[PDB]
Design a protein that fits this description.
Shape: globular
Protein name: NACHT, LRR and PYD domains-containing protein 1
CATH architecture: Orthogonal Bundle
Number of domains: 1
CATH topology: Death Domain, Fas
CATH superfamily: Death Domain, Fas
Radius of gyration: 13 Å
Number of helices: 5
Number of strands: 0
Family: Belongs to the NLRP family.
Subcellular location: Cytoplasm, Cytosol; Cytoplasm; Nucleus
C-alpha cells in the first residue's frame, strides 16, 4: 500500500526501534534546518511506531523536508545502509 505520503517510508522505519528511532527523531530536531537560538521545535512529540514517525514527519514538514532532512539525520547516527537503501532504486530488499 501507498500512504498519506510515505508507503515504503515506514518499511525503513520497521528495521529500527527505540534503540535509535528515538535518537533519529531527536537528532532531527537539533539539526532542524531553521537554525535559531534554541535548537528544538515546538509541541512535544507523541509518535512511537515508525509508521507514526512517518505521518508525524510529513506534518512537521511535508515529503520534502521530511525525507531530505531524514537523509541528513542518518549521517548523524551512521546508517549508511539506510542512506543507501533510500537511493538504491530498490525499495529496500
Amino acid at each position: 500500500m501507498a500512504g498519506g505520503a510515505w508507503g515504503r517510508l515506514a518499511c525503513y522505519l520497521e528495521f529500527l526501534k527505540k534503540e535509535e528511532l528515538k535518537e533519529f527523531q531527536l537528532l532531527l530536531a537539533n539539526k532542524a534546518h531553521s537554525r535559531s537560538s534554541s535548537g528544538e521545535t515546538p509541541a512535544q512529540p507523541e509518535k512511537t511506531s515508525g509508521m507514526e514517525v512517518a505521518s508525524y514527519l510529513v506534518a512537521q514538514y511535508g515529503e520534502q523536508r521530511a525525507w531530505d532532512l531524514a537523509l541528513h539525520t542518518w549521517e548523524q547516527m551512521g546508517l549508511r545502509s539506510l542512506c543507501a537503501q533510500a537511493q538504491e532504486g530498490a525499495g529496500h530488499s
